[PDB]
Amino acid sequence: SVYDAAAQLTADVKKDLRDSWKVIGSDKKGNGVALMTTLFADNQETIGYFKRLGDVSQGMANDKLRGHSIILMYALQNFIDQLDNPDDLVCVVEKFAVNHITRKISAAEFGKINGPIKKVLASKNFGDKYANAWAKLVAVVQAAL
Amino acid sequence: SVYDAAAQLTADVKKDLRDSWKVIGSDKKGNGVALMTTLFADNQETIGYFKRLGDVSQGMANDKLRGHSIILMYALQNFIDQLDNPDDLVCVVEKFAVNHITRKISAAEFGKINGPIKKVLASKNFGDKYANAWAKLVAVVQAAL
Numbered sequence: 001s002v003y004d005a006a007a008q009l010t011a012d013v014k015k016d017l018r019d020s021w022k023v024i025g026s027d028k029k030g031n032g033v034a035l036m037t038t039l040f041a042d043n044q045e046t047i048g049y050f051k052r053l054g055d056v057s058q059g060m061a062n063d064k065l066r067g068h069s070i071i072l073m074y075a076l077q078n079f080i081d082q083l084d085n086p087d088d089l090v091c092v093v094e095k096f097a098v099n100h101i102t103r104k105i106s107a108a109e110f111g112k113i114n115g116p117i118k119k120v121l122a123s124k125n126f127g128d129k130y131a132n133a134w135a136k137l138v139a140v141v142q143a144a145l
Numbered sequence: 146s147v148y149d150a151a152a153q154l155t156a157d158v159k160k161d162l163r164d165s166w167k168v169i170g171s172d173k174k175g176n177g178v179a180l181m182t183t184l185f186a187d188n189q190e191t192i193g194y195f196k197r198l199g200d201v202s203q204g205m206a207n208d209k210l211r212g213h214s215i216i217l218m219y220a221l222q223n224f225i226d227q228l229d230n231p232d233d234l235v236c237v238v239e240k241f242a243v244n245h246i247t248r249k250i251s252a253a254e255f256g257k258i259n260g261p262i263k264k265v266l267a268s269k270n271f272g273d274k275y276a277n278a279w280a281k282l283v284a285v286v287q288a289a290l
């Protein structure tokens with residue numbers, strides 16, 4: 001359930017999430033496009049879903065992909081800001097879950113973002129500790145799918 | 146064009162937007178729900194468009210309405226943060242425009258949000274100059290619809 005998943009975000013997890021978000025959230029365009037191109041390069045089978053964004057190999061030059069990527073980083077901004085209150089974190093998680101359920105994205109396929117996040121964190125010198133904290137936040141969205 | 150509408154927001158308009166957003170954007174849940182409930186109160190004809198949110202007269206108690214309202218406020222946060230780079234503001238505006246075009250929201254119907262915005266600004270004592278600055282930002286999205 002989303003409520004049990006949300007209960008796993010302990011004080012330490014929340015701390016690691018905010019501390020890493022301080023660094024990767026400072027460049028939403030850059031790290032957002034980085035997240036997306038790493039997803040597509042590492043998991044080429046997901047590109048079919050992003051048919052509306054056109055030629056994703058163009059990266060930053062693709063205006064629809066740049067728009068999409070910035071907006072995705074504000075969804076993560078939103079989750080970080082709701083960590084104090086689990087009732088609000090769950091209702092924004094469930095709204096974004098609906099946007100993925102209508103695109104037929106399963107929990108397993110949503111989980112493919114963990115690889116990209118681990119990599120962008122590692123290029124900013126945030127290791128496995130931080131990648132695991134973010135995997136727990138992704139798990140809250142997965143519970144809603 | 147959308148870029149034209151973007152490029153004409155002047156330094157004083159951007160200042161007024163940022164100053165009012167420092168206050169109305171600091172309580173995204175309270176002010177987002179207030180925005181949505183004032184739209185439904187004054188423009189009852191729009192209620193049918195939001196049937197996914199269920200009973201919107203429940204206000205803050207309605208989880209789907211609260212989640213939607215918080216996410217709307219992050220779309221505005223995104224717009225405010227992109228004010229100095231028209232190319233980034235135009236690609237995030239075009240993405241949100243697609244969300245409304247698919248729901249068949251015309252430029253005139255999107256403009257119905259100006260009444261709610263004026264009133265929420267007024268509750269924090271931001272007058273007509275501020276309401277006019279926000280109508281110019283809303284007009285950038287109308288240029289995409």
Ligand code: HEM
Pocket residue numbers: 046049050051052053068071072075076096099100103105109110111112113138244
């Ligand atoms: C950190 C995880 C992720 C977050 C926070 C996230 C967030 C978002 C947001 C905010 C949107 C825009 C929704 C809309 O306007 O309709 C979106 C769209 C989308 N997402 Fe995700 N997403 C994530 C991971 C994924 C993954 C891993 C997949 C695919 C396996 C996926 C597939 C989609 C698709 C297909 C769209 C629609 C694209 C379009 O047509 O514009 N998302 N996502």
Ligand code: HEM
Pocket residue numbers: 099191194195196197198213216217220221241244245248250254255256257258
């Ligand atoms: C400040 C202006 C507005 C902003 C920034 C805005 C933003 C948003 C956002 C971010 C979404 C979610 C998109 C998605 O998940 O697919 C949304 C949904 C929607 N908006 Fe707006 N919106 C605004 C004004 C309006 C107005 C004035 C109308 C109606 C005349 C409207 C009608 C809709 C509808 C029908 C939905 C879909 C609701 C649902 O089924 O979830 N929006 N809007």
